[PDB]
């Protein structure tokens, strides 16, 4: 099963040398590839505009670092730093302490949006889904400070919407 | 439901407010601080119980494999509320 | 066949709403296509869905002026979206937001704040953090 | 003093020092050397700059990550000033530029600027107000510029009296006023003594003034080593320079020495000479 | 106010002047540098906004620095970056560049390019895909709509 | 124990190749303050040339010391040629401080520092 | 056993156990360690004298061609006399076999030289002199290369910690990128993750 190329010859019919001799001289393919170029000149571009119109994409992209949050309930997290161990630069910083009702919670959840990568193993990691990778990507920032989430950072990021999260897992919870 | 603080500025959740001895209130001048007016603490109290006259109860959190595993809690005390730490929701029963 | 072309291709702006309808849009950035109206939602904004077009050229919005008072007639933004158009326009779903937009939550955002980065109103990092180790205070009572 | 105000470990990058640096000015040329040496220390330096963010933009990547900040003012304002230095440990004064303007002429700025700040400074609870002024600043004629100066001398040793007036001589550096004219040029001969200084000891002698207590409440003036004469200099910088009025008079007049408050040698720091920066600044010649 | 208006118009005229092509040159170190070359693709054109891609440094406007930037490559990035005419904006792009990443606590390896050069527009991602990255692009051209330099030095 | 050798037998072949390495250096110096429009004068170069060359005086072993010169003749022909920058030969200089002496009373103030 | 379990071949076993057999009788001078892994691919670990005799061998005798090179790193390894180990990696083409050429050496002794008995070891070798620090006596050129040229200390060592020894820096004073020691901005916060309870206990050594 080998099937090897640039084994042939200029075969000496007088065809054949005055056809060769015609591309030399005339440039038969040139006009040729030139036709090829104009066929696909007159067709129509595959463009968008794009204030208006978004390329496609999947319910399973990896996006905003969006926290969640239960139906009428609290927040979903509940600080049990697997995202930090699976995080493959570190960029979750997790600094946790109850409070006086009794459930358990943080104080201090931060991720560099430097270091982040957008693997998919602080979404498959987390045992309740607290964390999930947005939909969108917009972040686009002048200044670098303002690339450092707070927990109430991630916190109205994920209140900014979640029924578009909740789409997205409500569709696709199943493979995963 | 949020505060404000002696200083001028607000609190958090959680209680990590400033006073004038401080230099982060001027690198917090011009842009401003972005702090979450809904909490979370009273979105639990304000539920109320739900009650169930079973002994040894179920919990999911609303939904097959959305939300947090099952963990099944204890009613066994004359009056005082279980309460999950998944969920964060008391139960009471109804003997 | 010339004259049919132009026949067809005159109408859809006779019928975007006269001259100056796309007049703005025109100068606006580029949308000619117009003729679908699938739906208009907050901040007044306008989806047109064709199928005729090929993917990639089937949803797509006309913004507003002054959508949160910020002049925004030329300058349009990326998230100036609502959040169930904006499942709709990234084409990950292929049901219009129409048929279901909402939740039955009471804790999301009327808003949808857009980038706010350049402004005197945007955001900060800072330390969601109690008292480090308490330092010791002086005897604030007068000894001696 | 509230914790992460102290200083932390070593110097540099992160190393947190314990000094925080309102700076105005600054987004010309003293300014942006010491501005490097509060970034080189490991310092937090609150920058308010009346121009385009092009500039702040261009002497932004000094400091680390959100360490240096920015603010916009106009010196007429209280309110701006004051939100300017709500919360520092040290603000510096170094502000001036050395032409009548259309909005601004050279009286009132060395005067009213000072005041205002200095007033709101005093009212805002800071050390080390270091407030730069010229050599020879007198009531003595030919410069509005100096007479202004020696005004502004005397409002700031007028009110807050712990304020660190400091006096360098005719700085030169990387981009110097009177070197550039030196080169770019093509003029007369007289003869005036005259002793230059390089800028980096002289802001190193700031940041240490800055850094160092018991040095506030007197005046400096930083003295170059050299003191010879005006046109065998000039001829040394055209001799490295491969070539055979308000500010000329400024030059052509005096440059005299003052032996009676100290400098870099009681200080402890050490002033290079004229020689070797000299070589390092005479670049941009033919070929 | 006669030449206030007439000035302010001059700098709305200079200003969109400048906000209307900015052709870069295009750095692009690792496999963001094929994402540059992905949002030169049919898909998203930067043909449509005067931006040509050419690595001419001496008639380059901004300069979108990506891929994974090392201590090894610094000086020759910053003697680009001084034959540069003074309009000139930074765009960083990708995780290595915009601040080390995952390369972060490696040896020979630059921790962002802050400490390098001055920027202007941060974009993260990894890879920032055309649409982000597009994105950025109009948000360095609304920033070039907020300018008011000619305004300053009227004032001035 | 069989040590193979790098180079020598002795001190003898070490101390050969290192002056001969210092006379290549000392030769080598003014063409690179010549060629790279440089900033620093010919005698502070030449006293921390000789100042690298003194710093690592306690070693008797000739094997390290032939893998200094080494390690020297790789850095003589990367400077002989250009394949290095001027970034390289003013790190070699240190004129970015580090300020701090070895006094202990000001590694007191400046703590943690033993 | 049976179900998602990875099977292995006896025939390709056998032939492997007689061919370093063969191997390691008929080079009697240079032979310490003939080893077959269970997945069937052959290690051979060496002395440092033979390394020209040995591929000079190998590259040839007719029944065993191996012309295909693979890398070459001498892996470090702590807690012996000799530290580092040259891993030569070869690969046949008449054949499809892979046999693993281990030999050992420590910090200060050359080893000798394989640029001339395969071309391909060239870079190889000038990467590894770079970046672990065994020299190469008798070869053409040793330089830097992956390294900066004020970057030393052969940073692939244990010793040679996770971040290095220089941070550099646009600096405005002097107008140009310098040099200063390491401030790092976050940790690296380390884990203790070596679990204990033996998961294997086929590779117990065994205690005094
Ligand atoms: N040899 C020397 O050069 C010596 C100089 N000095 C003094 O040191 C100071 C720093 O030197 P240098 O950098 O050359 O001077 P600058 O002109 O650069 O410093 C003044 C700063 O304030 C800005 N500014 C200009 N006009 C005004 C105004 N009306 N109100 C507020 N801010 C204004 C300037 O430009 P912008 O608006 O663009 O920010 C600049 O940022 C100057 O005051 C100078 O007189 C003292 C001794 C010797
Ligand atoms: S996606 Fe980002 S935050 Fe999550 S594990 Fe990966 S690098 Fe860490
Ligand atoms: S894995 Fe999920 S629940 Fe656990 S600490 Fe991280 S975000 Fe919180
Ligand atoms: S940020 Fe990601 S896509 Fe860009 S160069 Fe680095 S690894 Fe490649
Ligand atoms: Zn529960």
């Known amino acids: ?176 | 439901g949020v505060r404000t603080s002696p200083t001028g500025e607000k609190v958090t959740h959680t209680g990590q407010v400033y006073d004038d001895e401080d230099y982060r209130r001027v690198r917090f001048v011009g842009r401003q601080k972005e702090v979450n007016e809904n909490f979370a603490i009273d979105l639990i109290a304000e539920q109320p119980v739900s009650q169930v006259g079973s002994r040894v109860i179920s919990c999911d959190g609303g939904g097959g494999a959305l939300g947090h595993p099952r963990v099944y809690i204890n009613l066994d005390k004359e009056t005082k509320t279980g309460t999950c730490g998944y969920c964060g929701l008391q139960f009471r029963q109804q003997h | ?144 | ?287 | 106010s006669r030449g206030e208006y007439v000035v302010a118009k001059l700098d709305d005229l200079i200003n969109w002047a400048r906000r209307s092509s900015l052709w870069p040159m295009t750095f692009g170190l690792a496999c963001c540098a094929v994402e540059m070359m992905h949002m030169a693709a049919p898909r998203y054109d930067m043909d449509r906004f005067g931006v040509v891609f050419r690595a001419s440094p001496r008639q380059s406007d901004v300069m979108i620095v990506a891929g994974t930037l090392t201590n090894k490559m610094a000086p020759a990035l910053r003697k680009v970056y001084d034959q540069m005419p003074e309009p000139r904006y930074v765009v960083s792009m990708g995780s290595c560049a915009n601040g080390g990443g995952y390369y972060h606590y490696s040896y020979s390896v630059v921790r962002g390019c802050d400490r390098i050069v001055p920027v202007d527009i941060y974009v993260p991602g990894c890879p920032p895909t055309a649409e982000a990255l597009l994105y950025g692009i109009l948000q360095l051209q609304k920033k070039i709509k907020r300018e008011k330099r000619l305004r300053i030095w009227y004032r001035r | ?114 | ?208």
């Open chain 3, 1 to 144: 066949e010339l004259l049919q072309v132009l026949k067809r291709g005159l109408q859809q702006v006779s019928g975007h709403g006269g001259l100056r309808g796309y007049l703005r849009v025109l100068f606006r950035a580029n949308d000619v296509r117009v003729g679908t109206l699938v739906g208009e939602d907050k901040y007044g904004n306008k989806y047109y869905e064709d199928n005729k077009q090929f993917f990639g050229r089937h949803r797509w919005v006309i913004y507003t002026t002054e959508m949160n008072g910020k002049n925004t007639f030329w300058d349009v933004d990326g998230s100036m979206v609502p959040p169930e158009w904006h499942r709709w326009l990234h084409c990950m779903t292929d049901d219009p937001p129409t048929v279901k937009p909402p939740t039955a939550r009471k804790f999301i955002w009327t808003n949808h704040k857009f980038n706010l980065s350049g402004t005197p109103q945007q955001y900060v990092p800072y330390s969601t953090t109690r008292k480090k180790i308490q330092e010791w205070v002086p005897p604030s009572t007068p000894y001696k």
């Open chain 4, 1 to 287: 003093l509230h914790h992460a105000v102290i200083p932390h470990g070593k110097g540099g990058r992160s190393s947190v020092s314990g000094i925080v640096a309102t700076v105005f000015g600054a987004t010309g040329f003293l300014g942006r050397y010491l501005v490097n040496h509060l970034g080189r220390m490991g310092s937090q330096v609150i920058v308010p700059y009346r121009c385009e963010p092009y500039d702040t933009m261009h002497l932004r990547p000094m400091g680390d990550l959100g360490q240096i900040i920015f603010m916009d003012w106009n010196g007429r304002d209280k309110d701006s000033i004051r939100r300017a230095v709500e919360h520092s440990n040290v603000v510096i004064n170094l502000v001036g530029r050395e032409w009548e303007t259309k909005n601004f002429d050279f009286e009132d700025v060395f005067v009213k600027i000072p005041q205002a700040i200095a007033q709101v400074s005093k009212e805002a609870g800071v050390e080390k107000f270091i407030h730069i002024s010229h050599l020879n600043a007198d009531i003595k004629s030919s410069s509005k510029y100096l007479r202004n100066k020696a005004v502004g001398e005397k409002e700031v040793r007028e009110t807050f009296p712990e304020a660190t007036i400091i006096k360098p001589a005719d700085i030169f550096g990387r981009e110097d006023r009177f070197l550039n004219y030196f080169a770019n040029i093509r003029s007369l001969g007289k003869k005036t003594v005259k002793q230059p200084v390089y800028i980096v000891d002289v802001t190193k002698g700031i940041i240490n003034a800055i850094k160092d207590p018991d040095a506030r409440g007197k005046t400096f003036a930083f003295v170059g080593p050299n003191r010879y004469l005006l046109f065998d200099l000039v001829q040394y910088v055209f001799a490295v320079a491969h070539r055979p009025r308000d500010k000329v008079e400024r030059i052509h007049t005096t440059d005299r020495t003052l032996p009676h408050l100290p400098g870099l040698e009681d200080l402890g720091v050490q002033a290079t000479p004229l020689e070797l920066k000299a070589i390092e600044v005479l670049r941009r010649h033919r070929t």
């Open chain 6, 1 to 114: 124990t069989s040590v193979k050798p790098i180079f020598s037998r002795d001190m003898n072949e070490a101390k050969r190749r290192v002056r001969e390495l210092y006379r290549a250096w000392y030769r080598e110096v003014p063409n690179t303050v010549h060629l790279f429009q440089l900033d620093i004068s010919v005698k502070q170069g030449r006293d921390k040339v000789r100042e690298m060359f003194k710093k690592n005086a306690h070693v008797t072993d000739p094997r390290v010391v032939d893998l200094l010169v080494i390690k020297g003749k790789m850095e003589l022909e990367e400077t002989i040629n250009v394949w290095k920058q001027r970034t390289h030969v003013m790190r070699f200089f240190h004129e970015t401080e580090a300020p701090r002496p070895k006094d202990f009373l000001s590694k007191f103030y400046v703590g943690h520092d033993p």
């Open chain 1, 1 to 176: 099963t080998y099937k090897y190329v640039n084994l042939r010859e200029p075969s000496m019919d007088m065809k054949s040398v005055t056809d060769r001799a015609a591309q030399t001289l005339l440039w038969t393919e040139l006009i040729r590839g030139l036709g090829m170029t104009l066929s696909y000149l007159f067709r129509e571009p595959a463009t968008i505009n794009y204030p208006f119109e978004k390329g496609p994409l999947s319910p399973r992209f990896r996006g905003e670092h969006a926290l969640r949050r239960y139906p009428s309930g609290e927040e979903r997290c509940i600080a049990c730093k697997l995202c930090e161990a699976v995080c493959p630069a570190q960029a979750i910083t997790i600094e946790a302490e109850p409070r006086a009702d009794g459930s358990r919670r943080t104080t201090r959840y931060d991720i560099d949006m430097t270091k982040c990568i957008y693997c998919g193993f602080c979404q498959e990691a987390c045992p309740v889904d607290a964390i999930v990778e947005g939909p969108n990507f917009e972040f686009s920032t002048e200044t670098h400070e303002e690339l450092l989430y707070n927990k109430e950072k991630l916190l109205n990021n994920g209140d900014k919407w979640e029924a578009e999260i909740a789409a997205n897992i409500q569709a696709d919870y199943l493979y995963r």
């Open chain 7, 1 to 208: 056993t049976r179900p998602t379990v990875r099977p292995r071949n006896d025939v390709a076993h056998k032939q492997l156990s007689a061919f370093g057999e063969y191997v390691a009788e008929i080079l009697p001078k240079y032979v310490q360690q003939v080893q077959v892994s269970c997945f069937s691919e052959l290690e051979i670990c060496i002395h440092p004298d033979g390394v020209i005799p040995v591929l000079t061998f190998l590259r040839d005798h007719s029944n065993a061609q191996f012309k295909s090179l693979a890398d070459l790193t001498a892996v470090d390894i702590p807690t012996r006399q000799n530290r580092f180990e040259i891993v030569y990696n070869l690969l046949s083409l008449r054949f499809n076999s892979r046999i693993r050429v281990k030999t050992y050496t420590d910090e200060l002794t050359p080893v000798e030289s394989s640029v001339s008995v395969y071309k391909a070891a060239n870079w190889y070798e000038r990467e590894i002199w770079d970046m672990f620090g065994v020299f190469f006596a008798n070869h053409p050129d040793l330089r830097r290369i992956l390294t900066d040229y004020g970057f030393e200390g052969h940073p692939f060592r244990k010793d040679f910690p996770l971040s290095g020894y220089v941070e550099l820096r646009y600096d405005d004073e002097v107008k140009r990128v310098v040099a200063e020691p390491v401030e790092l901005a976050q940790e690296f916060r380390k884990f203790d993750l070596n679990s204990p309870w033996e998961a294997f206990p086929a590779y117990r050594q065994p205690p005094e």
